Design a protein around this ligand. Sequence first.
Ligand SMILES: CCCCCCCC/C=C/CCCCCCCC(=O)OC[C@H](O)CO
Ligand SMILES: CCCCCCCC/C=C/CCCCCCCC(=O)OC[C@H](O)CO
Ligand SMILES: CCCCCCCC/C=C/CCCCCCCC(=O)OC[C@H](O)CO
Ligand SMILES: CCCCCCCC/C=C/CCCCCCCC(=O)OC[C@H](O)CO
Ligand SMILES: CCCCCCCC/C=C/CCCCCCCC(=O)OC[C@H](O)CO
Ligand SMILES: CCCCCCCC/C=C/CCCCCCCC(=O)OC[C@H](O)CO
Ligand SMILES: CCCCCCCC/C=C/CCCCCCCC(=O)OC[C@H](O)CO
Ligand SMILES: CCCCCCCC/C=C/CCCCCCCC(=O)OC[C@H](O)CO
Ligand SMILES: CCCCCCCC/C=C/CCCCCCCC(=O)OC[C@H](O)CO
Ligand SMILES: CCCCCCCC/C=C/CCCCCCCC(=O)OC[C@H](O)CO
Ligand SMILES: CCCCCCCC/C=C/CCCCCCCC(=O)OC[C@H](O)CO
Ligand SMILES: CCCCCCCC/C=C/CCCCCCCC(=O)OC[C@H](O)CO
Ligand SMILES: CCCCCCCC/C=C/CCCCCCCC(=O)OC[C@H](O)CO
Ligand SMILES: CCCCCCCC/C=C\CCCCCCCC(=O)OC[C@H](O)CO
Ligand SMILES: CCCCCCCC/C=C\CCCCCCCC(=O)OC[C@H](O)CO
Ligand SMILES: [K+]
Ligand SMILES: [K+]
Ligand SMILES: [K+]
Ligand SMILES: [K+]
Ligand SMILES: [K+]
Ligand SMILES: [K+]
Ligand SMILES: [K+]
Ligand SMILES: [K+]
Ligand SMILES: [K+]
Ligand SMILES: [K+]
Lengths: 340, 340, 340
Amino acid sequence: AEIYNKDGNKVDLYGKAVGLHYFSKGNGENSYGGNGDMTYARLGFKGETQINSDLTGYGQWEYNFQGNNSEGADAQTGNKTRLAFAGLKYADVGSFDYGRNYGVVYDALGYTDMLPEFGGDTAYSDDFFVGRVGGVATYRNSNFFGLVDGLNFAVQYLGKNERDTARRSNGDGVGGSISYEYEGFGIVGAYGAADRTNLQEAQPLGNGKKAEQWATGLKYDANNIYLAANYGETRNATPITNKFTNTSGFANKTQDVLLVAQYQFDFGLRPSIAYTKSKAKDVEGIGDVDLVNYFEVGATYYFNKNMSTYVDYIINQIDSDNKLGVGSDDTVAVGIVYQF
Amino acid sequence: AEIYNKDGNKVDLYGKAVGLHYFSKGNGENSYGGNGDMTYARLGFKGETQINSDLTGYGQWEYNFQGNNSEGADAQTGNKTRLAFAGLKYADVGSFDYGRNYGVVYDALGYTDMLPEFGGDTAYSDDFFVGRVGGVATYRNSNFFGLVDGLNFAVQYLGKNERDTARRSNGDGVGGSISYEYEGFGIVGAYGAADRTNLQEAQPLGNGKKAEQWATGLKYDANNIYLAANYGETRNATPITNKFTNTSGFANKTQDVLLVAQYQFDFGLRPSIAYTKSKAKDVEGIGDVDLVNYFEVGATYYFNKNMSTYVDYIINQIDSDNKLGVGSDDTVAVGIVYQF
Amino acid sequence: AEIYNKDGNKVDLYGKAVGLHYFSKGNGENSYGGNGDMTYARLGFKGETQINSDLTGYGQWEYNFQGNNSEGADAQTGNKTRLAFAGLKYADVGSFDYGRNYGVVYDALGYTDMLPEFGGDTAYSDDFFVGRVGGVATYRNSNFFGLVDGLNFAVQYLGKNERDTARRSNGDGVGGSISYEYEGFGIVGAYGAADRTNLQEAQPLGNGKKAEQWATGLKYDANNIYLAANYGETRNATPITNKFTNTSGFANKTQDVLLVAQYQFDFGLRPSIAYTKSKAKDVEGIGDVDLVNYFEVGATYYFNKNMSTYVDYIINQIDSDNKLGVGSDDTVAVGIVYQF
Ligand SMILES: CCCCCCCC/C=C/CCCCCCCC(=O)OC[C@H](O)CO
Ligand SMILES: CCCCCCCC/C=C/CCCCCCCC(=O)OC[C@H](O)CO
Ligand SMILES: CCCCCCCC/C=C/CCCCCCCC(=O)OC[C@H](O)CO
Ligand SMILES: CCCCCCCC/C=C/CCCCCCCC(=O)OC[C@H](O)CO
Ligand SMILES: CCCCCCCC/C=C/CCCCCCCC(=O)OC[C@H](O)CO
Ligand SMILES: CCCCCCCC/C=C/CCCCCCCC(=O)OC[C@H](O)CO
Ligand SMILES: CCCCCCCC/C=C/CCCCCCCC(=O)OC[C@H](O)CO
Ligand SMILES: CCCCCCCC/C=C/CCCCCCCC(=O)OC[C@H](O)CO
Ligand SMILES: CCCCCCCC/C=C/CCCCCCCC(=O)OC[C@H](O)CO
Ligand SMILES: CCCCCCCC/C=C/CCCCCCCC(=O)OC[C@H](O)CO
Ligand SMILES: CCCCCCCC/C=C/CCCCCCCC(=O)OC[C@H](O)CO
Ligand SMILES: CCCCCCCC/C=C/CCCCCCCC(=O)OC[C@H](O)CO
Ligand SMILES: CCCCCCCC/C=C/CCCCCCCC(=O)OC[C@H](O)CO
Ligand SMILES: CCCCCCCC/C=C\CCCCCCCC(=O)OC[C@H](O)CO
Ligand SMILES: CCCCCCCC/C=C\CCCCCCCC(=O)OC[C@H](O)CO
Ligand SMILES: [K+]
Ligand SMILES: [K+]
Ligand SMILES: [K+]
Ligand SMILES: [K+]
Ligand SMILES: [K+]
Ligand SMILES: [K+]
Ligand SMILES: [K+]
Ligand SMILES: [K+]
Ligand SMILES: [K+]
Ligand SMILES: [K+]
C-alpha cells in the first residue's frame, strides 16, 4: 500500500499473511509438494523518486518470513530476502537496475507462473537466469524507445556468485529477452548463457563449461480469460538429485513445457487448469527421466483485492519407479490470504 | 499505528523498542530470569478489509528482534515470527482463521498474564494449547450468534507439527473455550487435548500417548482496578528439564495457580502484586517438585500511550535444593518502552 | 519517511536498497574489502512522542538485510539488528537512552567516517566505545543546558556483555565526550575505559585488565567544503587476528590517524579523498604491525535526497608480507542507492 507520497518521492509498503496447508498421503516425502502447515508472511517496500520530468530512481526489497517454524531453534528456516535492488529509468531511453532480481529468462517463464499455489516449476531460485538471483545488472526498454508500443527487450549481465554449494552458485553470464504484447496478445523469447564454477563441474551429475537456458511463451490475457504456453530447453543448468545415490548436480539437458488456462468470473471465482512437464536427458547413470509431470486443477475465490482463498490440486503423473526417486504422490494445498 | 485506511482496507503497522535489563546475583544462572541486557524490539502488521456489510477479512504478522546480541555469529539468537495468520469474520455466524496464533487455552491464561515484565509463566510457546503455536485452525463466536451479549466460545483444531525437537512438537489435537464477560467481570474455562509424537514419547521425562491442558479464570477489570486468578492442570504437556541429569521432557502432571492484583492511578503509576505457583507430580525419578513459585511486586509508570517505564521484582520461593535444579535466586527487571 | 504524525506521536519508517559491487583481484581474499556482489538493504523505525511541553519520549530500531546471499542455507549471513534503544529527553536538562546504541567515542570518529563506501576503519562494532554496542546507557547534553550554543557533551555507562567470543565481549565501563563547534569549525574529544572479561584476557594477543579508547578530531564543514582529521589511541581494545592461523585477540596498543577531504558541488557531485593508517604496537611475537594503511579516491553523485550513486577506490598500502596476513590488494566499490 502507498504509505508515503510527498516532495517527489513515493513509498509502497506491502506484504501478506498466508494461512496455508498441504495434504498428501502418508508423511508427504513421496509427494509433489509435501504435507503439513506451510503458513508464511511477506513484507517488502518499493520506492520511486521523481528526479526530473524524465528521470526516475527506484528501489525495492522483499522478504519471506516462514510462519510454520517454532520459536525455537528452527525459527529462521526458510526465511530470506527475495529481492533487493535499485535503479534509474529515463523516459523512452530505458531502465537499469542492479541487485538481487529476476533473471531474464523469467521474462518468458512468468507467462505460465500463474497457478494459485503451485506451478512455475522450472523457475528455480539461484539458478542462473530462470528465477530470482543475486548480482544481476539489467537493462530494459519498453515500447522500443517510444517507437513501438508493446515491443520490449532486455539485456542482462550475471556476475559470478561462488557460494558454498554447487546448487546456488554461478559463473559470469549474459542473457536477453524480447517480447511483443498488444491488446491481450503476448509473445516472448529469452535466452541466457553463463560459465559454471569449478564446484559445479565437480559434481557427478552434469558436465560442461557453460550453462544455457532459453524459453518461449505465448499468451492471451484479456476479457476475463488467461491462456498461456511455455516451451524451453536447458543445458547443464537445472538442478537435480538422485535419491538412490544421494548425489546432486545438474541435468545435462532438459526440455520443459507448461500450459495454463484460467477464467475469471465477475463474482470472483477463478478456476484454473494447467499442465507441466519437465524432462531431463543424458543424466549420468540414468539417461532420460521426468523431473516434473502433472496436471493441475484449482481455483481462487477473490473476496476483493485484499482477501482471497484457494485450493490447488496436483494430479501427479510421476511414476512410483522414477529413476531419480522424484515423489509420485498427489498434493492438494488450501490457503487463505490477506494482503496489502 | 494506522498507516493506511482507504477503500475498505485499513492497515496498522505497529512495534516497540524496549530498553531492558535484568539484575540477579552472580551470573544469574541460578535465578528466576537471569541477568544482563535484555533489550529487544518488535514489528508487526495487522490488516482489516471490509468485504461487504457483514463480512470482513483480516491478517496479522508479528516478529521479535533481540537487541542484546552482537552483530556477529549470535546475531539471530532469540529472533522469530510470533504470529502469522489470516481469517474471515461473518456477521453473527463467527470467525475462522488459520496460521500461527494463540492456542485456545490462552483464552484462560490471558487473565493473569499482566505483569510489567514477568508472569504468564505457564503460557509456554510451541506447547500445544497454552501459547502461540503453529498450524492452528480456530473458530470463534462472539455473543453466541448475536443472541447473548458477552457469551463467547471457541473451537480449535491443532494440526500436527513433527519438529526436530520434542519440546517444540505436537500431534493432532482439538480444543475449546467458553467465557462470559460483562461490565468488567469475566469468567472463563478452556480445555484441549492432543496426540504426542513419537519423539516426545521417547524422551526420558513424561509418559503417555495424550497431552492435556485446561484452565479456569476469573477477573475484574474496571474502575482502575485489575484483579484476576487462574487455576489449571496439565497432563504430559508441560516442558521440564532436570539440570542435574541434563534430561528433558514433559511433566506427567502439573497443577497451576496464578493470582494478580493491580491498580492504576490517574497520574500514570500502576503498582502490581502477584503470586504464581506451578507444581509437577509423578516426575520420573523425582516425584513431586515445584516448577514455579514466587511472589511479585512491581510497577509501571505510563507517561502516555506511547511511552512507559517499569520495574518488576520477583521474590523467588524456589528452594536452593530444588530436585530439578530450578533457579532459586530473585530477579529484578527494569525497562523503558517506546511503542507505536 | 514520516508515515504517522498525530496526537503528539510521530513515526519515521525508513530504509534503503543498495545495489553494490566490489572489484579486487583474484578471489578477493588478500584484498582490502573482498570482491563480488555486496548488495544489501536496511529497514528501521524512529519514533518520538511529545509527553508534555518539555518532555519527549523516543525509540529507534534498525536492521541490516544482506542482498548477496542465496535463498538456500546461507540466507541469514550478515543479517542483524544494528540499533534498538528507547529513551527520554527533558528541556535543557538532557537526554537518556538505553539499549543497543553507538559508543561515545564514535562521537569523535564520526568526523572522518564520511567516505562513499569504506573508511571509518576503527569504529568497530561490538568493541567497547568506538561503534555500535549492546547494553549502553547514554546521557547527552545539548548546548550546555542551553547556555552555550555549540557546546555538547555526553556520558555513557557500558554494562558488561559476556558473550561466546572474546571478539564480541566486554566488561563494565564508563566513557564520555565533549565537542565545540563554531562558524564551520569543530573540535571533539572522547574517552572510555572498561574491564576486560576473563575470556578476553585468555586470548593469546593482548594483556591487561582494562581496555581504553580515545580519539580527538578537528573539522571544517561549511561552504560546500568538508575537511576533517582524527587522532586516537587504544589499549587492549582493537581486535586483531592472524589470517592464516587461529591466533586472535586484541592489540596491546594502536595509534590511529584518519584524514578526509571532500567537496560538494551544487549540481550533485561530491568528490572525496582520504588517508587512513592504523598501526598496532607491542603485539606479542610481532611488535609493530599496520592494521590499516590506505589512500582513497572516490565520488558520490546525488540525484536528490532519495537517489545517489558512487564509486570508492581504496589504494591499499599494506604490504604483501604483513605479519598478520592483512590483505594487501586494492578494492573498488560501485554502488547505486535508493533511500527513504
Ligand atoms: C469450487 C471449489 C470448492 C472445492 C473445495 C474443496 C475442499 C478441499 C479439501 C481438501 C482436503 C484434503 C484432502 C486430502 C487429499 C488426499 C491426498 C491426495 O491427493 O492423494 C490421494 C490419492 O491421490 C487419491 O486421490
Ligand atoms: C520466439 C520469440 C518470439 C519473439 C517475438 C518478438 C516480436 C518482435 C516484433 C518485432 C517487430 C514488430 C513490429 C511492430 C510494429 C508496430 C508499429 C506500431 O508502432 O503501431 C502500433 C499500433 O498502431 C498502436 O495502435
Ligand atoms: C560519482 C558518480 C559515480 C558514478 C558511478 C556510476 C556507475 C553506477 C553503477 C550502478 C551499479 C553498478 C553495479 C555493477 C554491476 C556489474 C556486475 C559486474 O561487474 O560483474 C563482474 C564480474 O562478476 C567479474 O568481472
Ligand atoms: C491443460 C492445458 C490447457 C491449456 C491450453 C493452452 C493453450 C495455449 C495457448 C497459447 C497462446 C494463445 C494465443 C492466442 C492469441 C489470442 C489473440 C486473440 O484471440 O484476440 C482476441 C481479441 O482480443 C478479441 O477482441
Ligand atoms: C470451474 C469449477 C470447478 C473447480 C475446479 C477446481 C477445484 C477442484 C478441486 C478438486 C479437485 C479434485 C480432483 C483430484 C482427484 C485426482 C486424484 C488422482 O487422479 O490421482 C491418483 C493417483 O494416480 C493414485 O496413484
Ligand atoms: C475457490 C474456492 C477456494 C476454497 C478454499 C477452501 C478453504 C480455504 C481456506 C482454508 C484453510 C484452512 C486450512 C485448515 C487446515 C486444517 C487441517 C489440518 O490441520 O490437518 C492436520 C493434519 O490432518 C495432521 O494429521
Ligand atoms: C470454569 C467455569 C467456566 C464457565 C464459563 C462461563 C459460563 C457462562 C455461561 C453463560 C451464561 C449466560 C448468562 C448471561 C446472560 C445474560 C442475560 C442476557 O441474555 O443479556 C443480558 C442483557 O445484556 C441485559 O443487560
Ligand atoms: C469463585 C471465586 C470468587 C472470588 C471472589 C473474590 C472477591 C473476594 C472478596 C472478599 C471480600 C469482599 C469484600 C469487599 C470489600 C469492598 C469494599 C468496597 O468496595 O467499598 C465500596 C465503596 O463504597 C465504593 O467504592
Ligand atoms: C498477591 C495478591 C493478589 C490476590 C488477587 C486475588 C483476587 C482474585 C479475584 C478473582 C476474581 C475477582 C472477582 C471480584 C468481582 C468484584 C466485582 C466488583 O468489584 O464490582 C464493582 C462494581 O460493579 C462497581 O463499583
Ligand atoms: C515505575 C518506575 C520504575 C523506574 C524504572 C526506571 C527505568 C529507567 C531506565 C531503564 C533501563 C536502564 C537500565 C540501565 C542499565 C545499565 C547497565 C547496568 O545498570 O548494569 C550492568 C551490570 O551492572 C554490570 O555489572
Ligand atoms: C562536563 C562533563 C564532561 C564529561 C565528558 C568528558 C569526556 C571528554 C574527554 C576528552 C577527551 C579528549 C582526549 C583524552 C586525552 C587522552 C588521554 C591519554 O592520552 O591517555 C594516555 C595513554 O594512556 C598513553 O599514556
Ligand atoms: C599546484 C596547484 C595545481 C593547480 C590545480 C588547479 C586546477 C583546478 C581544478 C578545479 C576543478 C574543478 C573546479 C570547478 C569550479 C567550481 C565551480 C563551482 O563549484 O560552483 C558551481 C557549484 O559549486 C557546483 O554546481
Ligand atoms: C571531481 C573534481 C576533480 C577532483 C579530482 C581529484 C583528484 C584527487 C587526487 C588525489 C589523489 C591522492 C591519491 C594518493 C595516492 C597515493 C598512493 C601512492 O602514492 O601510490 C599508489 C600506487 O597506485 C601504488 O601502486
Ligand atoms: C480461580 C481461583 C479462585 C479465586 C480465588 C480468589 C481467592 C483470593 C485469594 C486466595 C487465593 C488462593 C486460592 C486459589 C487456589 C486455587 C486452588 C488451589 O490452589 O488448589 C487447592 C484446591 O483445593 C485444589 O487443588
Ligand atoms: C560528471 C558527474 C555526473 C556523473 C553521474 C553518473 C550518473 C550516470 C548517469 C546519469 C547521469 C545524469 C547526471 C548528469 C548531471 C546532471 C546535473 C543536473 O542537471 O542536476 C544539477 C542539480 O539538480 C541542480 O540543482
Ligand atoms: K561433472
Ligand atoms: K553436458
Ligand atoms: K503418480
Ligand atoms: K517417555
Ligand atoms: K503420564
Ligand atoms: K529462594
Ligand atoms: K592475554
Ligand atoms: K597491554
Ligand atoms: K543532483
Ligand atoms: K599494497
